[PDB]
Design a protein around this ligand. Sequence first.
Ligand SMILES: Nc1ncnc2c1ncn2[C@@H]1O[C@H](COP(=O)(O)OP(=O)(O)O)[C@@H](O)[C@H]1O
Ligand SMILES: Nc1ncnc2c1ncn2[C@@H]1O[C@H](COP(=O)(O)OP(=O)(O)O)[C@@H](O)[C@H]1O
Ligand SMILES: Nc1ncnc2c1ncn2[C@@H]1O[C@H](COP(=O)(O)OP(=O)(O)O)[C@@H](O)[C@H]1O
Ligand SMILES: [Mg+2]
Ligand SMILES: [Mg+2]
Ligand SMILES: [Mg+2]
Ligand SMILES: [Mg+2]
Ligand SMILES: [Mg+2]
Lengths: 525, 211, 538, 49, 106, 526
Amino acid sequence: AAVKTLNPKAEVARAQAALAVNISAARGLQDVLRTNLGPKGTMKMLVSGAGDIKLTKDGNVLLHEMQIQHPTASLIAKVATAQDDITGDGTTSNVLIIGELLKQADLYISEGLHPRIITEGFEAAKEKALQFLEEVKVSREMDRETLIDVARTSLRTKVHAELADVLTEAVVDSILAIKKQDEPIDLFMIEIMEMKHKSETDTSLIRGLVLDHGARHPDMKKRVEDAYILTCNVSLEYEKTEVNSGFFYKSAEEREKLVKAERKFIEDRVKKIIELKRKVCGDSDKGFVVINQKGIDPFSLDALSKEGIVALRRAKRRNMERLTLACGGVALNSFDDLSPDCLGHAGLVYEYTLGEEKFTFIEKCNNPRSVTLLIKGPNKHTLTQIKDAVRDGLRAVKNAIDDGCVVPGAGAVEVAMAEALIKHKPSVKGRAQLGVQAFADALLIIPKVLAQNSGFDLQETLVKIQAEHSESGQLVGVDLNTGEPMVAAEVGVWDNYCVKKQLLHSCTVIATNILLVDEIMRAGM
Amino acid sequence: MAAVKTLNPKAEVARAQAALAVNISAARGLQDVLRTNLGPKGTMKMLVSGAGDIKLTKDGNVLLHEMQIQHPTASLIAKVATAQDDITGDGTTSNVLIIGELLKQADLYISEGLHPRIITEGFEAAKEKALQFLEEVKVSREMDRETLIDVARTSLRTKVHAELADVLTEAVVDSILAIKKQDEPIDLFMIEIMEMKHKSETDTSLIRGLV
Amino acid sequence: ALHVPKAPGFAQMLKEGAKHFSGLEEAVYRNIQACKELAQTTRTAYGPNGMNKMVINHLEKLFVTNDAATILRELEVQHPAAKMIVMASHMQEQEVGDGTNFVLVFAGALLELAEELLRIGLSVSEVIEGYEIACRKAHEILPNLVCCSAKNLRDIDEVSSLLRTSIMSKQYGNEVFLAKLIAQACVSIFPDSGHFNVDNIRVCKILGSGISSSSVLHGMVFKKETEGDVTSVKDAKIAVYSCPFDGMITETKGTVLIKTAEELMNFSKGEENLMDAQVKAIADTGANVVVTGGKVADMALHYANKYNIMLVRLNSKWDLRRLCKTVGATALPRLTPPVLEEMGHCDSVYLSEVGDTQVVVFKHEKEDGAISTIVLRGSTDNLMDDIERAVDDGVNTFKVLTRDKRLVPGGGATEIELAKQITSYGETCPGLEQYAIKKFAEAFEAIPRALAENSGVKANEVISKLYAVHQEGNKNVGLDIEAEVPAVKDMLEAGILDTYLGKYWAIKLATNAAVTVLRVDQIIMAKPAGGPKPPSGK
Amino acid sequence: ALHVPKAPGFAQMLKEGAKHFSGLEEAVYRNIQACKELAQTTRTAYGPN
Amino acid sequence: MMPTPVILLKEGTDSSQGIPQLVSNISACQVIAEAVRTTLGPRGMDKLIVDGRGKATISNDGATILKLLDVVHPAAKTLVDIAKSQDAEVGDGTTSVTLLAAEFLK
Amino acid sequence: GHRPVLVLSQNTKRESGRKVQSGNINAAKTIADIIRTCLGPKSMMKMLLDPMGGIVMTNDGNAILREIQVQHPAAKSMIEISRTQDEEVGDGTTSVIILAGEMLSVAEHFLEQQMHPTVVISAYRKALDDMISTLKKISIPVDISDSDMMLNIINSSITTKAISRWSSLACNIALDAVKMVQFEENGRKEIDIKKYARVEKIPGGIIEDSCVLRGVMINKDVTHPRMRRYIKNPRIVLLDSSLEYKKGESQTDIEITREEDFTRILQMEEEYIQQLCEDIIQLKPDVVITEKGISDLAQHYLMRANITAIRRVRKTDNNRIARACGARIVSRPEELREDDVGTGAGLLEIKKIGDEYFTFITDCKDPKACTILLRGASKEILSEVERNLQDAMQVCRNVLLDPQLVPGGGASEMAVAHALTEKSKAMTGVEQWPYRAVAQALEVIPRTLIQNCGASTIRLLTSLRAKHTQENCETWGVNGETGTLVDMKELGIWEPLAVKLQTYKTAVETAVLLLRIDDIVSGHKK
Ligand SMILES: Nc1ncnc2c1ncn2[C@@H]1O[C@H](COP(=O)(O)OP(=O)(O)O)[C@@H](O)[C@H]1O
Ligand SMILES: Nc1ncnc2c1ncn2[C@@H]1O[C@H](COP(=O)(O)OP(=O)(O)O)[C@@H](O)[C@H]1O
Ligand SMILES: Nc1ncnc2c1ncn2[C@@H]1O[C@H](COP(=O)(O)OP(=O)(O)O)[C@@H](O)[C@H]1O
Ligand SMILES: [Mg+2]
Ligand SMILES: [Mg+2]
Ligand SMILES: [Mg+2]
Ligand SMILES: [Mg+2]
Ligand SMILES: [Mg+2]
């Protein structure tokens, strides 16, 4: 070729070769990720170079963990990563739909048809499909039951059925706790903290915060019943002068005086804290907790502990906002003017010890606008899998709340969309009808893969579902236990409207762009 | 990685859908190469050996032999085409194309979870029906000079240039009709094919004797 | 026609060193085989008759022990499924402290029977569901099998008799002596408050006299020496300092600026007088022992020797904290004299020598205190390490007994009773789950079978006798290791008992590990890397 | 994403040392270039001069 | 034994089990005792051991001789450890301990 | 020993004669053939593999050429002219390469026929002058006040790209961005889209949601959570100096002998921070954006006055904000004046996109800077969309500077070729043959359009030439979709005159440069 003529060490695929390479890569990715789709999918074990174990079922995690060095695989991985970043679900369906679109397009391209006509058909089918999806969405007031149904539809696919049932309540309650009326939901206010000492079903929701650090002074109280929370960002350790100060003395007494004097700056702030603590609580009934983002040197820790104050240092940056929203205080960057109204209130603070690692709990808040999820599991990989599952569930619930409409799942929507596209095909002028048919047959992959993973076979299950949909018009999905058609809306299998729209748009765009590529080139050396 | 791998570490195995994909890909590649051969409008291929000998050809069997392939499925299809060429002497390109298309159309259904046994049963039924139809559609005729000329045209035009084909048609028809004995099998050994290298390629002809 | 090319698709896209295993034969059976191999390696150390294993790690540090968790820790396991089983065993060790070998044996038996069930035709999901149902049934059954409770933990005889079974598995020959020692050590700790801390028991290993000479000390022992002239104190009034025993210095920078000859001539004298005044002020409080966490200046040491003060230096902050706990002193951050509440008291502090080791002993006289120390004698470092592991097992058993007082019969009686009851339950369950339930029940047989194999008798007759007796109606009958012929006896009379929490957690963790291993269908292993460990492990 | 794999089909089945040139630009134009080069080498010896 | 594509432990791991390893351990202890036998009694003889640096340690004490031996056998190291223990607790008898232990095993 | 003696150093190769000319022309033809297929509305995209592991799936000629590495120097010259065309006018990168390759190819014919390259170069320059004359003759004026015609021009620019599907939205975005960026000061017109028309790509969402903001958008968040994330009519103060306490450059050392000097020094540091914050507060702003860090104490002092602050913002983003909201960046807050306070922004909102915080200063009135927020399938799709938007904005700027338009789709090529042939018909010297050769070589663009359309080249191109032989047919080209000859006054495809002028000049000058070259020498060291 020309590239090899100019650059001898160049790798080039041209035209039919380019299509073959791209479609083979897409087919390989589809074949790998077929087994993921649906709650009846198969979990994979992912061993890294260092031997770390990663048990997962998520499409994005799998794609990031397969040892693949292919260009088209990289493009599809980028598309799935964008899918996960924005909506947080549908990556496996994304890959499956891309692969099926490419295969259906190749089914016609191999018979002399030019890919441009296929792409025109894809565009027309995508527009009609988006219109139908607009028509078929179920607008609903998002109560607790609907959110529980959506969270179940996600988690049951991600994890074990009983663990999914626990995580449904956990995630729904967590989202409802921080949700404010007609205000965007900030998922940063749901802290995901994981411990590694009990069973997987012990994962729960704490209406407060769990901090992965505890008090550094042994004499500080390990449990405070009623506490005032002081959220501060002030250094309480020794600080050096910015201008290279140094000390000069002529005797040991002068050295002692200078040693005692150099601590006065920190001692003043500690004294302000102690005076505030004395003012707010004149007895031992109430407690005082100091959570500081910066260090606290041992002298300050001892001084505070002699006053019965629990002090936590080097807290997380987000923990400032989380504590202000949950406990209800004011985060302070200086003690210039500190007043009792700036103190948060927590109805219980105690420390939990887990071997070498220590944790602090802050519960019984008044109206916690930030909560934490405690992931508990006997294994590290169990913790990672549960963390990914709760991330997916939180994204699903947030999307369901943001979009007042929800879409029936179980593959029903794809069947209805395929039938609508087939009905609309005669209205398309020219040979773009072939592209429309390819798009419909590609959309039909979801019920096919669900039937495969459920142990049934694609053909008669799909034709039964299609016949049932034609006879009644209801949004009938796939019953993963019997294989019979089933109304997903009645049983409560919901899919996010935003996820479906994103799948349609991204899959169509990437498939069109890949089909129009006629040359992979590598001549950068 | 499998049963055979444990006993023989240096063993190469492709199992189940892997083997099916390997075979179908090989057949599809052969079909892609030989697609351009079919018909009088096909394209000549230039084949150069290791020693540098040049061989311009369009025959499917010749191209299969002179292709640089080391694939098992390709070897099987090459053996089938070789048997076809040995017995009937025509249809090798059609053999490869039909085999490849059969495998492709079968995989079109197999990828949808259909077992290959059902496809093979359908193939057997379709084959017997097709044989019946072919028996019903053939044209019984008296093989006069004109019909033989037409058949020779249909072959040689697909093999060579039109004018050379026109010359070779008369040559071959006269040669066959000269050695043909009534109600006796035709001995093709009695038609010597001697080549001389001094005139134009349209000067080839038939000699009612021996050289 | 002489090479089989890689299949189009994923096979060609796989990296150069990666491995991909998919399907029953390539993944599940291989994982089950690896787990079975691991369990088989650890099996021979199960029970009192289990035998130690000499294990050499990658650093050529010799370990000899029959503790399953230690063996697994010192074994370089590479198979991911065996890694998962090892993680389950280590979680069992961390949560309770004993039963790790039970975890391996049960997980291996479960996976083997699951493999045979998959062979006969059952699907993975059906086997998993059957195991889950059977585990729930076993957890329901277990509380009914409780025979007796501790019902007192401040006694010495009862605590020793309870911990004897726990520390009879390790160190089978001499467990009464170790039981008495650990019982005394734990009874000194565990005050009126119900909370019991495992870390409040310290083990000091001094070589030479054989383990029969080991003792328990109501105090704390340091393998150090006094830094002063005084080597013995009768009525210690310890004053603990976290600061170095020296004059303080500025944290920014300190330069002695001298402008006149008088300052130059008086600086050293003034500094020495300041140090002498500080030391005398410390001594005037009555403190006759000073423990410091930092270095000791020469002038400070001289002035301490002048006032008859013992000096002890502890490098580790953990040692300083534990000494403060066991004495009752407060770690002063500065060199100010301690107030009366901050001054700790010890009934006797003295420098002593044990074998060839010089030690400093903070010895009480009361049978109380926050921390108690067990001094371990012996003839080998490895022997003392094994004794320390047995001591840890006994202490964890005591902690569990504080958490839950219920006990179940040992010697395989509990496992056989569980197997019988689960088998009876499974026969009443129609459907394909009955096979999985029956196999889960049969997996309990591996415990008495392993015990009988290690004891040197034929396992099958032991198991048949156990079923016969249990069918007769005796739920507290187990293996009798004190016999050369397969025989059984009542565990309750013999006092061979196991903690209820230990069995509960062991069953739960083994079932969870087995089910999680079974849930895996495809394995994608990255090419191994020779990197110097991930940074998280340091 | 750093190496272009060989296209499935005949491209992979080709032997190690074999070359396959197909299409107008890859075959006809290159053959014409070679023939033109040969004629160029022999051209200067034409005629009495 | 089958290749088992994915192995349990790292390759190069050596495992010895059963009666033969115990008999080998006893033989190793016998070798260790023989290395110090002739240093016992008023008619005992000294041993000269040269390290890698070239320094010579002429000795009759059993514990010193055992320490200077670069013993790597896990079962044999027990005899060296008990010699060190006897030296630490008492100071004499470092040859008798090894001789008695090896004799028990034999 | 006796090492060899030689004039030039080793590895110093040298070639000469017709071989060098043939090699140069073949290299240029190869470079042209690389991207020949990427011209026209029916172009096929190419997928390029970055040495760093990235993927560039693009249709632009300049990107394709710059993403490959070549060793032949003539190929390097071709890459350079492609980059020059891309920088100068913004598009036509894959047309100038084809034109230069064709011109060199037709010059090779005359080179082999004993014609000295100087004669060919003179004829080429005469042809270039006459091409300039003809293009300036057949041009048409444009009123930039008509937004519909500008949108049509941008569309005709972007029909050949991947954004042709959303052409309407893309054209509106490009036109609005160019119009807002347009600025004038001190009587100097300026349209600087490379500094004040920022394109921000956020993967995800749908490309229909892409829009141009009446403001700016930066990937930043408030320093302190208690700071306001939503202000209606903010007063903005921009700084490019730290709000912290810093050492002086002079080597200053303190010497402390008294007890209270240490605490006094620390207290004066705090008081200095407070004084700076009070100097800022005296103007009563609402948001403070700094290029350098902001100390926590400074954050507290600003928060006491209910002021939102963003800590570290790049220089380009700060300049863009200053252009948008009308602020003025000041280094020392003590010199802060009322004029420096940025009023004009209509809203400051710090919202969350995906898992990131983004700061919006949109809703400005009369903003001179803009941020084009791009959303789409993935990163590569967004990169290609950004390249297409760059092409559109460059075309819009060219039209704004020069309101002249010429017919597209090969109509200009054939018209200029016919005019050149008619003018050459009166020539008598030997120079007429290369002159006519360049004239007919200019016809490669319609031929390439027909080839990419899949139609028959010979008969369609002959019919197009016959149509252009008539008098009033200068606007007759081809359809890039249906492969038929249509009047571009009806189809509506037009391109800026500046683009065509630059393309022709660059092509002819590259042909001249590569024709002047002989006797390649290589191997020496710097
Ligand atoms: N219990 C169920 N019954 C029937 N269909 C289900 C059930 N749960 C999920 N599904 C369907 O299976 C699909 C599961 O896809 P999933 O595994 O979540 O892929 P992704 O994680 O990429 O979204 C959903 O589209 C949903 O419609
Ligand atoms: N004297 C005894 N007679 C019979 N069985 C015993 C006796 N002592 C302990 N066992 C059994 O040995 C088992 C303990 O095995 P062990 O080696 O401790 O494994 P792990 O350390 O994992 O608990 C217990 O289940 C108990 O039933
Ligand atoms: N609809 C159309 N029909 C015919 N020709 C067109 C059409 N749209 C654009 N063109 C032609 O295509 C050329 C632009 O192709 P493009 O890929 O942008 O190349 P370049 O990047 O060199 O401008 C212009 O010369 C224009 O005349
Ligand atoms: Mg999902
Ligand atoms: Mg034929
Ligand atoms: Mg045990
Ligand atoms: Mg002696
Ligand atoms: Mg352009």
